[PDB]
Amino acid sequence: QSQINPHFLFNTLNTVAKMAYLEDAQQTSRLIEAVAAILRYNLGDLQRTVTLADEVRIAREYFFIQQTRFFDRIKFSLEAEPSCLDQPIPPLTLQPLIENAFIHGIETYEQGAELSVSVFAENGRVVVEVRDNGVGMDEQVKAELEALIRGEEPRTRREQGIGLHNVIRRLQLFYGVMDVAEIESALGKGTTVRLWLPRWQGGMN
């Protein structure tokens, strides 16, 4: 179950933010503002519709926080075509991919990790690429994800926040198409998770 209570955490973060302002701790206030933004977004209704612009905004807050702590170890890159950012999308689509690539990087490198996010149009899809230079994801994990993308329910296992499996399922349900992602990975050559989202000039629901 969840051993943490998020509502208490969020309110407490607000109290910390108030004290940081009262003590004129400007850099502390900026960090709290970033993590409060992420927490608030992740606590929202998971069935709402947002746009890629909202997802990218949250990504920037994440990179600001992580850069503060890990500046010597990992390089972050974020690029996006503006015309793609009004794409409707389920919330918390991008963050699980970014967290995945971040863990890949810091587990593989003392320094030299790389995490890149790219958002761009290709034919009639909006492509979202999240790339890391890690050691490459496990072959069986990759196979089960690809089976899920094809519509085959993978093996149910005990003790199975939001992972790549849930992201893929929510995208398939949201867009009404199964082929919403592909995974590119090889030993020593890193991992790219590439989302292929049907271009929707507007449909939240």
Residue 60 near residue 37, CB atoms below 8 Å: no
Instruction: Give the number of other Cβ atoms within 10 Å of residue 51's Cβ.
Output: 18
Q: Which is nearer to a copy of itself, 36 or 141 (CB)?
A: 36
Q: Which is nearer to Pt ion, 67 or 83 (CB)?
A: 67
Answer yes or no whether residue 186 interacts with a copy of itself by CB under 8 A. no
Q: Which is nearer to Pt ion, 74 or 119 (CB)?
A: 74
Answer yes or no whether residue 116 interacts with a copy of itself by CB under 8 A. no
Residue 94 near residue 118, CB atoms below 8 Å: no
Residue choice 56, 99, 136, 197 for contact with a copy of itself (CB under 8 A): 99
Residue 137 contact partner, candidates Pt ion, a copy of itself, none, CB within 5 to 8 A by sort of partner: Pt ion
Residue 23 contact partner, candidates a copy of itself, Pt ion, none, CB within 5 to 8 A by sort of partner: a copy of itself
Mapped to the 3 state alphabet, what secondary structure does 29-73 carry?
HHHHHHHHHHHHHHHCCCCCCEEHHHHHHHHHHHHHHHHHHHCCC
Q: Which is nearer to a copy of itself, 27 or 123 (CB)?
A: 27
Query: Whole-number minimum distance, CB 1 to a copy of itself, in Å?
Result: 6
Residue choice 48, 53, 58, 65 for contact with a copy of itself (CB under 8 A): 65
For 154, the 3-state DSSP assignment is coil
Report the interhelical angle of 94-108 vs 52-70 (nearest 10°). Answer: 20
Q: Which two tokens stand for residue 159?
A: 């003790």
Query: Whole-number minimum distance, CB 146 to a copy of itself, in Å?
Result: 22
Answer yes or no whether residue 173 interacts with a copy of itself by CB under 8 A. no
Query: Whole-number minimum distance, CB 37 to a copy of itself, in Å?
Result: 12
Site string for a copy of itself, 13-42 (x = CB under 8 A): x-xx--xx-xxxxxxx--xx--x---x--x
Q: Cα separation of 181 and 171, whole Å?
A: 9
Query: Residues 37, 4, 165, 176: is their CA dihedral positive or negative?
Result: negative
Q: Which is nearer to a copy of itself, 125 or 170 (CB)?
A: 170
> Of 156, 48, 59, 51, which is closest to residue 102 (Cα–Cα)?
59
